[PDB]
């Protein structure tokens, strides 16, 4: 099973590279992170930072969630992220994605005790 925190890690964390490794990154990672099992998920962001740096965002700038409520927080620093967005010719089960590297402030939803990231809301 996956707690909300654990699912966030699966869907959104990849501390093992400093940035998308190549233009094939999302094509590989959307599959490997189990985001294409039952459908092609259209959009998903990965964060190339330590989990400790991402966790601290839950104490940074409080903002309204895009979806949630107002349990979202925007990072003071920018972070290395990858935007994965389904391409027009994609069709399940052949899910294909544009990989875009970015360096943006992230916005996460946080919950629990301990109070940790559970959703990737947005970037700015």
UniProtKB/Swiss-Prot annotation:
It is an enzyme of class 4 (lyase). Its main location: secreted. Keywords: Disulfide bond, Endonuclease, Glycation, Glycoprotein, Hydrolase, Lyase, Nuclease, Secreted, Signal. It comes from the Eukaryota. Pancreas. One of its GO terms (biological process) is defense response to Gram-positive bacterium. GO terms for cellular component: extracellular region. Belongs to the pancreatic ribonuclease family. This is Ribonuclease pancreatic. The gene is RNASE1.
């Amino acid at each position: 099973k996956e707690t909300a925190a654990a699912k966030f890690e699966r869907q959104h964390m990849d501390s093992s590279t400093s940035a998308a490794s190549s233009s094939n990154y999302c094509n590989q990672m959307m599959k490997s992170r189990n985001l294409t099992k039952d459908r092609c998920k259209p959009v998903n962001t990965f964060v190339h930072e330590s989990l400790a740096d991402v966790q601290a965002v839950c104490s940074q700038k409080n903002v309204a969630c895009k979806x949630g409520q107002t349990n979202c927080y925007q990072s003071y620093s920018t972070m290395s992220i990858t935007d994965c967005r389904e391409t027009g010719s994609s069709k399940y089960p052949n899910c294909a994605y544009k990989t875009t590297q970015a360096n943006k402030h992230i916005i996460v939803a946080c919950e629990g005790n301990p109070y940790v990231p559970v959703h990737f809301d947005a970037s700015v």
